[PDB]
DNA sequence: TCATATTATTACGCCAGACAGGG
DNA sequence: CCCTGTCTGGCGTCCTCTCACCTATGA
RNA sequence: UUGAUUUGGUGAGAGG
């Protein structure tokens, strides 16, 4: 459940960077392809992106990783699948 | 039950894109001049994005909105508000020659 | 996608690229069936065809050949809105001159061919004739002609002679109108001439010349030849409910144009005489201008009744234009409004909301839920389950609300508290149900109120609701540090009721083992609520690092207080709620939290406070009864001796001892003193009324009155009105201003009478005008002030400075009035503080001062800190993240994007409705003295007498922090010392102010210097007392052939040469001003401190007029410059005075209106930011003379007098940096070998950023002068000239903006709003970082 | 029905900004 | 020629709800 | 391809 941001806002420490990162986690979650790193209450998008904030998980960098991996991933599989 | 109303889609007027007024016409609420100032005031930049692009003028805006949402997408594809495109002819109508530059 | 927007004129091939088909007939529709007019102003060809990819007429009724246009036709085939961007073009027969251009104050036409607008009517009109190019005649190029002038000139001159008039003989001058000639010349004419008002018309001339030659707009382009005419779809004919079309007013201005046009063509077709066609000329240009600006020529035309017609510039301009009614503000879907009502079983983060908004707010969201499950299958048979709403779509919308925040908005909304973000929860009912403490941000009472409701539709916009605009996250009102979810009414009477004690109750004296036994011995009927017990509490103090500490101790309590510690969280003393616990109790006791524990306990204990609250309210049963407003007895004993004073004073009135002024104040003061002992007698019958006994005699106690307690704990009810409720209502006042001699001796308990109540009428009445007038003013405030900030955004981390203003407490003259810790809390220190004690680094020089650095200031007693602040910052274009200062409303630093001059400018504006529309020093204290800006003598007796003016006596206390500040006079009697110790209520000054004393330094003997009786002074021997004294005379009632002389006085010695000056080689003589007595004769020896002679002599429009930058209409006077003074020449408009400095070089001067009385004489020097009278003084001078942090000090001082007059907190970084956006325009002193102008004004961060880049290379930069404008002058004149639009006059700046050629890159927070895009403050400065990175 | 085209009331209160008048 | 009355333009609060009323002419 | 007119503008009154 959620009543507050505070432990997000903590952790993401500019308060208006905090939407953005919770905004692309939860569109990697809703069209998405992917699944949480969290265990979801029926919470929605929203909540599990924050609820992923708050115990550290999910920042900025950590989604750039994952989307290099992601890109990474994709040229292996256009390179072995081609060549 | 004279006071409660709402609105989500419905008719808009002729020259401007935006929504109607009123409760006998099924119309939206006016987002005035000082609720523009309170969300400037937050950092709230896309709500107020979406609160006069698309909630309220942008057709292209709203039509692809409404698609999005019905399919399971929240998201914006902004576009420029209609009412500023009919501010662009009414000062041009004058003999002024205003324009929107470079890429 | 794009950047800036450009505006100029438009040029004929650019109306004519604009266009699709001239625009013929003015032949609307048929109006008899349904087609328009082929072809007429709503033509087929030239615009398109009305229906989507149809010919209007007949063919292509499919989708193949989009485009093809047959001759039956005469119609394109596109969209149904393709001719909304579509634009005709009318071939305007005869020239016609824009209305923007020659009539926009100053005319673009009036000062570029240097002709006065009176005569450029006059030829526009026909009425005058204008010559051009003659020839080899007697005339001039700008010269005009009349008709004798003409006819005249066309029998001498029949040859080579050109003498038009009209648009067409302007056009001409303008075409052939050399600008880069008249560039030099106007350049040359400026460097070749002194005369002050020359060089500004000269100045103002060559900017408009010059500006015209760097963008590519003509001087032909003026004249209106290929007139525009707007799009048919936003000129709209659309018919009301019935047969008759109600059409436009555009559709009659251009069908009159045309019409016109039309008769103009076929007259110049006919050869018709000069005088038709001259009329049919000057009807088509007052029908063009009519056109374009409607009613800016004489009387404006009307269609229907009476009421005039609505133009172009009326559909751009007003409150009702573009700007302020579709683009700034844009009526929006996915919205909702109802009417509110409490539901108290809410946590603060939700709101309740109703089933049926629930279901119509949320329709595209049902629609998608009900598609994903597989229910339904196309999006009708979805519209039609919600239509019919069956029983499945309730779980789909419990589904979609869950997690999904609104914003709820209070219609006036003034501040950003007014638009919070809840969770729904549903409600039986219509009735928006809101959460009680939140009510208090809204200013929202029950009693009518309707909220709107809107939806976050996006994620980013969910995300931003949950994460800034939540409920939880506004707990601090942004203007101060004090909380927002303060409990209001109901809950602190409950807590008051709870947390309070009686001399003997149930179970008193009884010991209990916890607080929990304490709530069961209230509930199982053993104990009272409030009956005085020793119980054990364990209070958590976190004393460690993060580390809580249990401490577990018997505290004498009551049984209220243990409960209330049920509840309070783990970190809180208990000491919080050992107390009674009234209102500013209770909001410390939830600021305490919030400073200790955080955020989370702070939401969560301000639930548990107002649960707890209702709850023992409700067990409470505080009633109000007829009995709880206690009489009191004495009251009617005080009301007769009243009625004995004044039948005394009146049996004098009879008798004439007194006079009439004199018995007004006297029953006025005796009145006042009953007033204040029925209050008192009254107060002490309530606050103490109790008086219950225990195991024995009796004892006293503070009463369990109902309306006592409602006043006591600051729920509703203050002393005022719990006076009149009880005590007499005071001296009412008619509304002439003045109060009345007769007061209203009766309460409301007691019955008034007729005319009682009539005099409470007129008292009322005003008060009701006052805020029904006073909003409009507050709401315009409000929207100057945000308008004037609109641009400035954090946008660094440090500008990298040392400079910042001095923040000291305030102190008017009675004890200290607002202390440094709420000056210097949480604003970033610009040096490091010096302990008081010797030179230590108490605190470092870039340290954020909060509460616990404010403690160890408070400790060390310091004296005053030199702090950064925001109109000191250097950050080109925003303001650092340092020089703000704290967020308030968050702990930490500024965020860097938050839009600070936003939220300043609500600050400052939202308290407009609570602030109003319409001898000798005592001391107080006992300290030590000091004395700044002294220069003294003893005189002979021993008091210390000043020779200075301006001296400030401070009363510094034994630690070193400054607790009194005075002013004292030129030549006043000082009981006191510099560096003494005084005794408390001891007088320590005297003067006399009707007796301006021309005291000395040295003694010696008196001569009359230039001092003769019958011309220079007077005699005039006392009536009643016989010792007589010279008068001096002023320099008016003396004839012109004395006029001349100066009477003054000497010192000399007792030979008779002249006692110098100690520390100079001149004589001491002082000229006798006018309207002088001569109170020591001649001969008579003097010393210091002895006079030479008798020298007889607010609240909501003083913010407007600070903040506006008024001047006074009889300002204080000051000196340009240092140095010697001297008067001049004798009354020709004004008296001169002349000031020559000791090093600088001499020739100002100043023409005083004589009609002030003076201050300096003539033997005095001088300085800058020195007065020389008295009065009010504006805020240019302040600026131009003592500094820029003086007049930033000045405002933040003379507008928190008044926020403080009405008691409103308010933090002074919001008035800071109001007022850097006051000064933030420039001018020129020195242009140096850069390219600006001599006298040009240029903004601030311009010429910085100029002389920054051209100081780093070799050469040496331009040196500025910085010039405060108002606010309404200050938002219209910025380098955005959208910013400048949506503001007042579009007119004028889209005049100036178009002949300028000027370009908007976009950059600030309207500009955004107006174009539809995010804003660069707050979730959007990243996109903008983004997109100003990637340039 | 289908072109023809504009006249006999006053009663705000500052507050800047530009203009002819005169010592 | 620098003060100066005098005249002309340009402001004057947001949000909402109900109702009625809409150019004359004319061979 | 499955449907339609107030906004426009005035005046008066009301709510917060
Ligand atoms: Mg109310
Ligand atoms: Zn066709
Ligand atoms: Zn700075």
New interface residues.
């Given amino acids: 459940a959620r009543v507050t941001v505070q432990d997000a806002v903590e952790k993401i420490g500019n308060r208006f960077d905090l939407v953005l990162v919770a905004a692309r986690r939860a569109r990697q979650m809703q069209v998405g392809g992917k699944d949480p790193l969290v265990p979801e209450e029926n919470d929605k998008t929203t909540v599990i992106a924050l609820r992923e904030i708050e115990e550290g998980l999910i920042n900025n960098q950590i989604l750039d990783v994952r989307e290099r991996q992601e890109q990474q991933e994709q040229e292996a599989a256009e390179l072995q699948a081609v060549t | 039950?004279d006071?409660?109303?709402?609105?989500?889609?419905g008719s808009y007027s002729?020259?401007?894109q935006?929504?109607?007024?009123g409760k006998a016409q099924f119309?939206?609420?006016?987002?005035?001049?000082?609720?523009?100032?309170?969300?400037?005031?937050?950092?709230?930049?896309?709500?107020?994005?979406?609160?006069?692009?698309?909630?309220?003028?942008?057709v292209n805006g709203?039509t692809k909105?409404?698609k999005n949402?019905?399919?399971?997408?929240?998201?914006?594809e902004?576009?420029?508000?209609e009412?500023?495109?009919?501010?662009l002819?009414?000062?041009?109508?004058?003999?002024?020659?205003?324009?929107?530059?470079?890429? | 996608e794009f950047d800036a927007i450009k505006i100029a004129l438009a040029s004929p091939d650019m109306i004519r690229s604009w266009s699709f088909g001239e625009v013929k007939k003015p032949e609307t529709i048929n109006y008899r069936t349904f087609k328009p007019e082929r072809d007429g102003l709503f033509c087929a060809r030239i615009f398109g065809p009305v229906k989507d990819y149809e010919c209007l007429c007949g063919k292509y009724k499919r989708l193949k050949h989009r485009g093809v246009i047959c001759e039956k036709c005469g119609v394109e085939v596109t969209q149904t809105k393709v001719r909304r961007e579509r634009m005709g073009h009318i071939e305007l027969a005869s020239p016609t001159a824009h209305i923007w251009f020659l009539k926009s104050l100053p005319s673009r036409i009036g000062l570029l061919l240097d002709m006065p607008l009176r005569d450029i009517e006059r030829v526009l009109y026909f009425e005058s004739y204008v010559v051009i190019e003659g020839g080899m005649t007697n005339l001039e190029r700008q010269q005009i002609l009349t008709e004798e002038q003409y006819l005249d000139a066309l029998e001498e001159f029949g040859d080579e002679f050109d003498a038009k008039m009209g648009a067409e003989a302007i056009q001409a001058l303008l075409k052939s109108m050399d600008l880069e000639q008249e560039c030099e010349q106007l350049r040359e004419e400026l460097n070749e001439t002194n005369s002050e008002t020359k060089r500004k018309k000269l100045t103002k001339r060559i900017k408009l010349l010059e500006a015209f030659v760097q963008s590519g707009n003509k001087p032909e382009w003026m004249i209106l030849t290929v007139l525009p005419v707007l799009p048919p779809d936003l000129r709209p004919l659309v018919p009301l409910d019935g047969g008759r079309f109600a059409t436009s007013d555009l559709n009659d201005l251009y069908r009159r144009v045309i019409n016109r046009n039309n008769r103009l063509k076929r007259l110049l077709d006919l050869a018709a005489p000069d005088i038709i066609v001259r009329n049919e000329k000057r009807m088509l240009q007052e029908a063009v201008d009519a056109l374009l600006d409607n009613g800016r020529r004489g009387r404006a035309i009307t269609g229907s009744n009476k009421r005039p017609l609505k133009s172009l510039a009326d559909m751009i301009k007003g409150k009702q234009g573009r700007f302020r009614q579709n683009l700034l503000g844009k009526r929006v879907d996915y919205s909702g409004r109802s009417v509110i009502t409490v539901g108290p079983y809410l946590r603060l983060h939700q709101c309740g909301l109703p089933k049926k908004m629930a279901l119509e707010l949320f329709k595209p969201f049902i629609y998608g839920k009900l598609e994903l499950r597989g229910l339904a299958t196309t999006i009708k048979a979805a519209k039609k389950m919600v239509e019919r709403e069956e029983a499945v779509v309730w779980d789909i919308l419990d589904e979609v609300i869950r997690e999904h925040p609104v914003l709820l908005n209070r219609a006036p909304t003034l501040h950003r508290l007014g638009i919070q973000a809840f969770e729904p929860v549903l409600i039986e009912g219509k009735a928006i149900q809101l959460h009680p403490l939140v009510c208090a941000a809204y200013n929202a009472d029950f009693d009518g109120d309707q909220m709107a409701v809107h939806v976050p539709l996006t994620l980013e916009a969910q995300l931003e609701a949950r994460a800034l605009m939540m409920s939880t996250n506004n707990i601090l009102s942004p203007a101060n540090g004090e909380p927002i979810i303060v409990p209001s009414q109901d809950v602190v009477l409950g807590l008051y009721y709870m947390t309070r004690d009686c001399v003997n109750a149930k179970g008193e004296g009884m010991v209990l083992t916890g607080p929990k036994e304490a709530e069961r011995l209230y509930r199982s009927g053993l104990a009272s609520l409030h009956a005085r017990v020793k119980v054990r509490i364990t209070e958590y103090e976190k004393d460690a690092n993060g580390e809580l500490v249990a401490k577990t101790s018997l505290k004498d309590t009551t049984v209220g207080r243990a409960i209330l510690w049920m509840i309070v969280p783990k970190g809180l003393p208990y000491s919080i709620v050992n107390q009674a616990l009234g209102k500013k109790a209770i909001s410390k006791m939830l600021n305490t939290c919030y400073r200790i524990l955080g955020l989370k306990p702070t939401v969560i204990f301000a639930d548990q406070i107002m649960y707890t609250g209702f709850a023992y309210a409700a067990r409470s049963g505080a009633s109000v009864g007829i009995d709880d407003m206690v009489i009191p007895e004495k009251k009617h004993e005080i009301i007769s001796e009243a009625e004995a004073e004044v039948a005394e004073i009146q049996e004098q009135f009879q008798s004439g001892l007194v006079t009439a002024g004199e018995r007004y104040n006297k029953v006025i003061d005796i009145w006042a003193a009953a007033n204040d002992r029925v209050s008192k007698a009254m107060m002490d019958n309530l606050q103490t009324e109790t008086v219950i006994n225990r195991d024995g005699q009796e004892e006293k106690q503070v009463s369990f009155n109902s309306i006592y307690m409602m006043a006591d704990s600051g729920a509703r009810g203050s002393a005022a009105q719990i006076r009149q409720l009880a005590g007499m209502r005071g001296l009412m006042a008619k509304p002439d201003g003045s109060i009345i001699e007769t007061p209203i001796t009766a309460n409301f308990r007691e019955g008034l009478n007729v005319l009682q109540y009539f005099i409470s009428t007129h008292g009322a009445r005003k008060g009701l005008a006052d805020t029904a007038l006073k909003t409009a003013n507050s709401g315009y405030l409000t929207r100057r002030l945000v308008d004037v900030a609109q641009d400035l955004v954090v946008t660094e981390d440090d500008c990298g400075t040392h400079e910042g203003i001095m923040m000291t407490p305030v102190i008017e003259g009675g004890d200290v009035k607002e202390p440094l810790r709420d000056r210097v809390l949480g604003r970033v220190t610009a040096e490091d503080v010096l302990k008081p004690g010797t030179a230590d680094i108490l605190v470092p020089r870039n340290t954020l001062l909060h509460e616990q650095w404010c403690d160890l200031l408070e400790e060390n007693s310091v004296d005053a800190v030199k702090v950064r602040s925001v109109v000191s910052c250097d950050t080109d274009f925003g303001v650092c993240a340092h020089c703000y200062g704290r967020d308030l409303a968050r702990g930490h630093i500024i965020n860097k994007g938050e839009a600070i001059g936003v939220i300043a400018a609500q600050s400052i504006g939202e308290p407009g409705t609570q602030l109003t529309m319409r001898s000798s020093i005592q001391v107080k204290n006992k300290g030590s003295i000091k004395l700044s800006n002294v220069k003294s003598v003893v005189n002979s007796s021993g008091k210390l007498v000043i020779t200075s003016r301006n001296t400030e006596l401070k009363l510094i206390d034994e630690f070193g922090r400054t607790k009194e500040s005075y002013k004292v006079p030129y030549g006043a009697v000082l009981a006191k010392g510099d560096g003494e110790q005084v005794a408390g209520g001891e007088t320590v000054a005297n003067w006399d102010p009707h007796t301006m004393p021309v005291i000395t330094e040295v003694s010696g003997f008196v001569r009359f210097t230039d001092m003769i009786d019958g011309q220079t002074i007077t005699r005039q021997t006392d009536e009643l007392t016989g010792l007589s004294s010279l008068v001096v005379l002023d320099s008016a009632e003396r004839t012109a052939g004395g006029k001349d002389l100066r009477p003054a006085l000497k010192i000399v010695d007792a030979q008779g040469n002249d006692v110098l000056i100690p520390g100079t080689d001149m004589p001491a003589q002082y000229f006798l001003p006018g309207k002088a007595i001569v109170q020591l004769e001649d001969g008579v020896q003097i010393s210091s401190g002895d006079t030479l002679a008798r020298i007889p002599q607010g609240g909501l429009p003083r913010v407007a007029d600070l903040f506006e930058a008024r001047r006074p209409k009889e300002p204080a006077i000051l000196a340009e410059i240092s140095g010697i003074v001297s008067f001049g020449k004798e009354t020709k408009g004004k008296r001169r005075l002349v000031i020559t400095p000791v090093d600088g070089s001499d020739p100002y001067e100043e023409m005083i209106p004589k009609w002030r009385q003076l201050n300096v004489f003539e033997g005095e020097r001088v300085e800058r930011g020195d007065v020389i009278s008295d009065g009010p003084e504006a805020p240019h001078d302040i600026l131009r003379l003592r500094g820029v942090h003086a007049v930033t000090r000045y405002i933040v001082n003379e507008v928190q007098d008044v926020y403080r007059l009405q008691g409103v907190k308010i933090n002074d970084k919001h008035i800071e940096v109001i007022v850097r956006q006051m000064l933030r325009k420039a001018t020129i002193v020195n242009a140096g070998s850069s390219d600006f102008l001599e006298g040009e004004q240029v903004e601030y961060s311009r010429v910085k950023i100029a002389n920054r880049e051209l100081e780093a290379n070799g050469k040496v930069g331009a040196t500025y002068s910085r010039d405060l404008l108002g606010i309404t002058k200050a938002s219209l004149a910025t380098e955005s000239f959208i910013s400048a639009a949506s503001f007042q006059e579009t007119t004028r700046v889209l005049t100036e903006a178009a002949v300028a050629g000027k370009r908007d890159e976009l950059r600030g927070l309207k500009e955004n709003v107006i174009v539809g895009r995010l804003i660069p403050a707050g979730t959007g400065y990243a996109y903008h970082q983004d997109r100003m990175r990637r340039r």
């Avoid at chain 2, 006071?3 to 889609?9: D, E, N, P």
């Avoid at chain 2, 949402?69 to 914006?76: S, Y």
């Avoid at chain 2, 002819?89 to 890429?103: A, F, Q, V, Y």
């Fill in positions: 039950d006071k409660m109303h709402a609105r989500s889609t002729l020259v401007t935006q929504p109607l007024g119309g939206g609420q006016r987002f005035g001049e000082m609720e523009v100032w309170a969300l400037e005031a937050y950092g709230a930049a896309y709500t107020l994005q979406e609160m006069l692009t698309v909630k309220s003028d942008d709203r909105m409404y949402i019905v399919d399971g997408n929240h998201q914006m902004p576009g420029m508000p009412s500023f495109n009919v501010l002819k009414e000062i041009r109508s004058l003999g002024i020659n205003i324009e929107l530059e470079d890429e």
